[PDB]
Amino acid sequence: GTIYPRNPAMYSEEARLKSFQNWPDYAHLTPRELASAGLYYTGIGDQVQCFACGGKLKNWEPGDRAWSEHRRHFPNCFFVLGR
Amino acid sequence: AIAV
Ligand SMILES: [Zn+2]
């Protein structure tokens, strides 16, 4: 195909959700919201990554939403643009 | 959030 995910295994939303097993207790966004926005946990801090574009986000702030931060930083991601 |  003409696009290709940075992480094919994390193609699955269920696989992304499982990655949050050890999501830290101070990290306020839910695994559900993050995984739905294409994001999985990298295992470091509160840093997540998109399976599609490969963009990484950290240092989440109160009021942040997963989709709006994903689209603001990585607007040309195929997952963002396919939503 | 910030991009890495
Ligand atoms: Zn993306």
Residue numbers in the entry:
A (entry chain A): 151 to 233
B (entry chain B): 1 to 4
Original paper wording:
The Gln197 can move away, resulting in a pocket that allows longer moieties in this pocket, as was shown in the P4 Ala→Val→Ile series. We have shown in a series of peptide-bound structures that the protein is somewhat flexible and can adjust the conformation of the side chains in the binding groove to accommodate differences in the peptide.
XIAP (X-linked inhibitor of apoptosis) directly inhibits the upstream caspase-9 and the downstream caspase-3 and caspase-7, and therefore controls critical apoptotic checkpoints. The XIAP protein consists of several domains, including three zinc-containing BIR (baculovirus IAP repeat) domains (BIR1, BIR2 and BIR3) and a C-terminal RING domain. The linker region blocks the active sites of these caspases, while the N-terminal regions of the partially processed caspase-3 and caspase-7 bind the BIR2 domain in a peptide-binding groove that accommodates the four N-­terminal residues.
